[PDB]
Amino acid sequence: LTDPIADMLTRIRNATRVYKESTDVPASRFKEEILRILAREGFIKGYERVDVDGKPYLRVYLKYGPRRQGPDPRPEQVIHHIRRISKPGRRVYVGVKEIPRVRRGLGIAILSTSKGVLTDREARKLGVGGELICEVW
Amino acid sequence: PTINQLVRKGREKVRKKSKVPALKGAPFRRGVCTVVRTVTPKKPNSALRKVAKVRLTSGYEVTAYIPGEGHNLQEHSVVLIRGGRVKDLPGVRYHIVRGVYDAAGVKDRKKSRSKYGTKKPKEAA
RNA sequence: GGCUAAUCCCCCAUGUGGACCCGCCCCUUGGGGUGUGUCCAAAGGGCUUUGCCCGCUUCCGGAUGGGCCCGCGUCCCAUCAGCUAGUUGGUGGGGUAAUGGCCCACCAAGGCGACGACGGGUAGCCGGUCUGAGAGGAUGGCCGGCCACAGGGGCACUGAGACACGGGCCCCACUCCUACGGGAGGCAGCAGUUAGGAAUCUUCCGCAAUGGGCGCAAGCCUGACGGAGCGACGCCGCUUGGAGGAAGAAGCCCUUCGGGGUGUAAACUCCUGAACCCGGGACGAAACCCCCGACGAGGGGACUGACGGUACCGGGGUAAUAGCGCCGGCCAACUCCGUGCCAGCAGCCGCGGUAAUACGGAGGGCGCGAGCGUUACCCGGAUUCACUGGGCGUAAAGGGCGUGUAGGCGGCCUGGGGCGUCCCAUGUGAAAGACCACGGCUCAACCGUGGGGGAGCGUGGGAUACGCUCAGGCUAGACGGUGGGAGAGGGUGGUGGAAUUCCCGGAGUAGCGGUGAAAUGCGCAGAUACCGGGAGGAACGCCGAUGGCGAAGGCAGCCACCUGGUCCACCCGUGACGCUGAGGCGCGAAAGCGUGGGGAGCAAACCGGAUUAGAUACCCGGGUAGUCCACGCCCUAAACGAUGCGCGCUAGGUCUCUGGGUCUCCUGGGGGCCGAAGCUAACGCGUUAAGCGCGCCGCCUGGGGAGUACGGCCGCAAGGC
RNA sequence: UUCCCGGGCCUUGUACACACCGCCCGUCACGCCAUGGGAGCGGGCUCUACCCGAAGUCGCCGGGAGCCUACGGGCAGGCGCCGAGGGUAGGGCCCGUGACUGGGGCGAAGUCGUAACAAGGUAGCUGUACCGGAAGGUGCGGCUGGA
Ligand SMILES: [Mg+2]
Ligand SMILES: [Mg+2]
Ligand SMILES: [Mg+2]
Ligand SMILES: [Mg+2]
Ligand SMILES: [Mg+2]
Ligand SMILES: [Mg+2]
Ligand SMILES: [Mg+2]
Ligand SMILES: [Mg+2]
Ligand SMILES: [Mg+2]
Ligand SMILES: [Mg+2]
Ligand SMILES: [Mg+2]
Ligand SMILES: [Mg+2]
Ligand SMILES: [Mg+2]
Ligand SMILES: [Mg+2]
Ligand SMILES: [Mg+2]
Ligand SMILES: [Mg+2]
Ligand SMILES: [Mg+2]
Ligand SMILES: [Mg+2]
Ligand SMILES: [Mg+2]
Ligand SMILES: [Mg+2]
Ligand SMILES: [Mg+2]
Ligand SMILES: [Mg+2]
Ligand SMILES: [Mg+2]
Ligand SMILES: [Mg+2]
Ligand SMILES: [Mg+2]
Ligand SMILES: [Mg+2]
Ligand SMILES: [Mg+2]
Ligand SMILES: [Mg+2]
Ligand SMILES: [Mg+2]
Ligand SMILES: [Mg+2]
Ligand SMILES: [Mg+2]
Ligand SMILES: [Mg+2]
Ligand SMILES: [Mg+2]
Ligand SMILES: [Mg+2]
């Protein structure tokens, strides 16, 4: 691994593209805060701490849409798109005046502040900003 | 590339070439002609296009096209070089302005006569 | 040569104070104070006078301006890779207002450079301006700030300040005056002349306002400045009329000749009224001046305009310039006539060789309008340099392969710092430009006033999620340990047989080889075919393949030695030791090169004989280097899976190679096929990804010229990069 | 139903699509354009070493030779270093030009041959070496962009 957060979000993406019930990402505190935000906004059904072969993983329980009708009956995604911004090769840091609109407020930019790991609206209300981790919509 | 390769090397700008070497950006170059003759174009066409090889004030000696129907250009005519190439004529990258120095305008031309350099007539009108 | 005056010079005196050495104290790199010793000041002038005003000298403080130094940013060429003699540092001096290697002596040998030194080319820089959705790209004209120059170059003096446009000295070049021997000059100041060039103006008015210098003031100087003149050079505003007006005059164009278009367009009727005529006529201007008041504050009075009789106001009053580009698709506008690959048009596609909406004209229509087109340059479209925002299997592109330096990136838990990062406050970010609002020119252009923040950087305070560092700990990453496994992995030495060729011996005949058919050729000098023996060299049949090994090239009889890589099981130890990798280094098919050896078969070049019109080829017979070995070079390729490496995720079915097991079966590594989701322009890929993501390196920016030329490096050369 | 001529269906290959009476390659001949090498010629920029070296700051002398307003001092003058620039000699870089020569590109429809595209009539391509008017042929090894 080089960036464990991009590995976690890519594993969540590949889980959403095949409509799996749950997957296992490695356990970290920062990953747990990201999954806390993804559970508070309603992109997943929540997480739990599990131990696979004595080694701590995380059961990310996936959320999907209603089973559609007509051809291609795969349901619409909850997580249509997820992409890391602040790469370990190219770090991104923004201020409070520099927090983007994300699909006209429909999406979210999870970003890391000095007051903890926050969202785009919580970094505007508190007025802090920081390292812009990823976008989810 | 990667981000580090863009730090170590960066991007390369375009650095184009001017198609008109008329000495440091002059829109017009005065010149005295040397040889006035007719040439033949490329295969897709067939005509006798009127040209003149002009020795001009930048030290260059280029060939230019003579537009219009008929001209008064000779071995020692002082012309003005405009710019722009002729596609069917290789080597010709220039035009001769009419209505200046020694290149008079097209006689009896009335529709498009600013280009080709002809005065307004007056047929009691 | 001789007088002579000063706010000119010099000497003596006092010393608030200042300077210098020494010592001490505070501060702490030359700041402040103190004691002894020493040194250093001056100038008068004018009135309404023994009272002021302008001046003088020393010092301290303030304001403004400036010198010097430092952090960061600032074009292209790596076909510029090594640069450095005062060069780098110290000590003592000189010089400066002042640090400084600025300069000079002595000592040391350092200093800079892939984070791009040195060199070459180009360029004044910035606020800003143009474009662009933004990010960016381009640019530095007018205005403002800084720099540097005043024909080229060098130098000092006066001076608070200059290395000094209109000051000085010298050398070179140019012009002019010379009685020839020695003198004057420096428009890149405002006009203006000449040359160059596509191109850039008036040898105008005034100090009336602002500002600068001198002077107590009156006042004087100011080509700064305020204006006027010229150029559609740009922008803005206005005019060449408006309302009526024939089922629609004439001319002209088209016509299926009945008609349609120009076209309310025109002529014609009413009306307003540009330009012109008359009269008036300024804002910009109020101080400095004078009087009262103590020439203070305050009040009052008087003089002064270039622009200019100009803007403007009032009355009268005339129908009064329109042109330019286009009309095939982009792209808006269609017919006729002339021409007929001719004349010609053209930004691309491309038209014209007889019926052209593309050439030329006419009618008409379109787009602008005192402008319209063309040319030159910048941005855009160009997401064709992709940070935003591109790609590399086949279109351009994965380095031939590995090791590995710098660099880039990096697993889990808990603390300290708070550097990156974030927040707040404060200072700066000049003015002008841009944005918004309100106003002044009758609008606008132009201008004024007010407000609002950008970005960056200094300082203070606060936060620790992430990146960083320090410290403690953990094991999934990586490596090791133990016990095994498979393999054409590599090097050295030895060895077995089949087969080919040659030599010898026996026997044996009139043909053998060869082709599509022939021929050259070999053969009664006893061939081919048969047997026996001997010599020599090269490659290893069957096993043996859709197989295995290796990083690639590549590796295949067998045996022995030396040796690397790799896989499984046990989960034993270290404990983040990891991944990639610009250079460098090593390996690197075949052909080729050098030295020596060897040479049976094959076989470039060469020689024949056929085919063919011709054969420098294909076919056949000979045949030299080479193919083989040792050592040293050469570094190329369809070196290909045309797919770089490492890691994590994402249905499976099936064949096979190799371990382990609790052997219907499960698990690990590897080699193939079909295929979920997904990707691709398609072919196709598909856990051996070309899918989903991260880290790093290499590479691409239309084809040809061209992997060519020049330069550099390597090679004996061919040649390679 | 092997052969020659014409034809129908399927499949494979193509660089053909005015469609094999297709396309296309290279040498030679003529003209033009740009360019490399080239005995050399001319010019510009720059570096090093030395010789001469004005004005001028600075450092000594200021004396058998001057002038002074305060003299164990000053001015003039003299000597020395640096010194713009001029000269000499040798390098480096760049630009134009040069008899001749190599190859590139475009032209009018030229001459010779058949290389490649279909098994293009010897499968093609590539590295290397040799040879041949020329495309090319052959030898070794490699690839499927053919069976
Ligand atoms: Mg005292
Ligand atoms: Mg005294
Ligand atoms: Mg310059
Ligand atoms: Mg753009
Ligand atoms: Mg001059
Ligand atoms: Mg002066
Ligand atoms: Mg002057
Ligand atoms: Mg002229
Ligand atoms: Mg004045
Ligand atoms: Mg004044
Ligand atoms: Mg009217
Ligand atoms: Mg009518
Ligand atoms: Mg009519
Ligand atoms: Mg006034
Ligand atoms: Mg149209
Ligand atoms: Mg047209
Ligand atoms: Mg026409
Ligand atoms: Mg106008
Ligand atoms: Mg762009
Ligand atoms: Mg462009
Ligand atoms: Mg990108
Ligand atoms: Mg692309
Ligand atoms: Mg390719
Ligand atoms: Mg490769
Ligand atoms: Mg490595
Ligand atoms: Mg980390
Ligand atoms: Mg910090
Ligand atoms: Mg400002
Ligand atoms: Mg640690
Ligand atoms: Mg253990
Ligand atoms: Mg090799
Ligand atoms: Mg070899
Ligand atoms: Mg050899
Ligand atoms: Mg020998």
Ligand SMILES: [Mg+2]
């Ligand atoms: Mg043979």
Ligand SMILES: [Mg+2]
């Ligand atoms: Mg024949």
Ligand SMILES: [Mg+2]
């Ligand atoms: Mg014959």
Ligand SMILES: [Mg+2]
């Ligand atoms: Mg043979």
Ligand SMILES: [Mg+2]
């Ligand atoms: Mg292969």
Ligand SMILES: [Mg+2]
């Ligand atoms: Mg497998």
Ligand SMILES: [Mg+2]
């Ligand atoms: Mg497949």
Ligand SMILES: [Mg+2]
């Ligand atoms: Mg090209």
Ligand SMILES: [Mg+2]
């Ligand atoms: Mg080559």
Ligand SMILES: [Mg+2]
């Ligand atoms: Mg049938």
Ligand SMILES: [Mg+2]
């Ligand atoms: Mg043919």
Ligand SMILES: [Mg+2]
């Ligand atoms: Mg030539």
Ligand SMILES: [Mg+2]
């Ligand atoms: Mg040459």
Ligand SMILES: [Mg+2]
């Ligand atoms: Mg030469």
Ligand SMILES: [Mg+2]
């Ligand atoms: Mg000569």
Ligand SMILES: [Mg+2]
């Ligand atoms: Mg022929």
